[PDB]
Ligand binder design. Sequence first.
Ligand SMILES: Cc1cc(-c2ccco2)c2oc(N)nc2c1
Length: 154
Amino acid sequence: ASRLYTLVLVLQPQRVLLGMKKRGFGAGRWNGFGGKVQEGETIEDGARRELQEESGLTVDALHKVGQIVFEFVGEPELMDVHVFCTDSIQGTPVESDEMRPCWFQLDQIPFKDMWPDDSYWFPLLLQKKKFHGYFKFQGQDTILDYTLREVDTV
Ligand SMILES: Cc1cc(-c2ccco2)c2oc(N)nc2c1
């Protein structure tokens, strides 16, 4: 009962790019860039497309860094989120009516205004670790339970 999604973090040695979504799912939080994977598209090509569509950047190499399954209690469909990072981009982030991108220094990551799971796995991403996670939410603000482990391959 799972649907594929991508999430891409643009992570340079001293800063990370995040976007504030204006509407829809996740509005009002900072997050990486991503969305649903399409019919006939690989997960990685989906990740590249969503980065490009939502941020305006052009990405060359993407690196798999994690997989997180999200459950919302009562909702049948699980979100199977494939997480990628890149430090090899072209262009400048573009603010649109849907998305406002902003660079953050690594010691000023805005965890209080991000999805609450990010506090758990972002520190792993920043230390170049790979991970498998599962988070069970009740509504959008409450983590009921979770698992998170480091892995050598995603
Ligand atoms: C429930 C949930 C979903 C997503 C998501 C959907 C599509 C891409 O990511 C999240 O992203 C983060 N950082 N927490 C998240 C929680």
